[PDB]
């Protein structure tokens, strides 16, 4: 499947790519404002992760650091990042369908829009201000907007037991995403598309 990755944003971003366990593409790549890189991900791969990482230093060797979304020092990603971090989530070919969501269960640290560009179902966003609208508790002082699990590590925040309810942090990301996961156990916004569907992720999709 093809995901074009594309940086609306005036900043440069540096997108990443992963499974967990492994890089999906090369796993991360420089995108200055206005740049577009298209990555090829395997049908069939499980819990993958389309984040941007900001204020990002890397050496000849591509091993650095980022103020947000940082996996291990590297450029090319083969681990999740460090949180805060908007995420682009996906599951491909799991029965003949893929299921895409995004969710703010890490934090925010860029708007996003992730969109199918085949047919058959529809895109999911969370464009406002997280960041400017942040909680004075969740602000990173490395930029972004905390989870309240990062900031806190409580089982209820961190859903710990599958026993949590929304909370007054999780409603503040609802509110001004309703269409990203604010929480373990959100009321789910996944959107299932056609098996093999291809995808747009566009960083600060409005502005």
């Known amino acids: 499947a093809t995901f074009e990755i594309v940086n609306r944003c005036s900043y440069t971003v540096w997108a ?40 990002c230093y890397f050496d000849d060797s591509g ?4 103020k947000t979304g940082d996996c291990g020092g590297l450029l090319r ?11 682009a989530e996906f599951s491909l070919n799991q029965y003949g369908k893929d299921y895409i969501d995004i ?8 708007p996003m829009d992730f969109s199918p560009t085949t047919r058959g179902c529809r895109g999911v966003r969370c464009a406002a201000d997280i960041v400017g609208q942040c909680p004075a508790a969740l602000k990173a002082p490395g930029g ?42 959100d009321k789910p916004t996944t959107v299932t598309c056609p098996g093999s569907s291809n995808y747009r992720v566009t960083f600060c999709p409005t502005a």
């Open 144 to 185: 972004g907007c905390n989870d309240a699990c990062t900031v806190f590590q409580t089982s209820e925040y961190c859903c710990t037991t599958g026993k949590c309810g929304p909370t007054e942090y999780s409603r503040f990301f609802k509110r001004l995403c309703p269409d990203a996961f604010s929480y373990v156990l």
């Open 103 to 110: 969710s703010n269960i890490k934090g925010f640290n860029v």
């Open 63 to 66: 091993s650095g650091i980022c």
């Open 77 to 87: 990603c083969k681990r999740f990042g460090r949180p805060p971090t908007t995420l």
């Open 16 to 55: 990443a790519a992963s499974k967990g366990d492994a890089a999906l593409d090369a796993g991360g790549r420089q995108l200055n404002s206005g740049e577009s890189w298209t990555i090829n991900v395997e049908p069939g791969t499980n819990g993958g992760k389309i984040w941007a990482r900001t204020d």
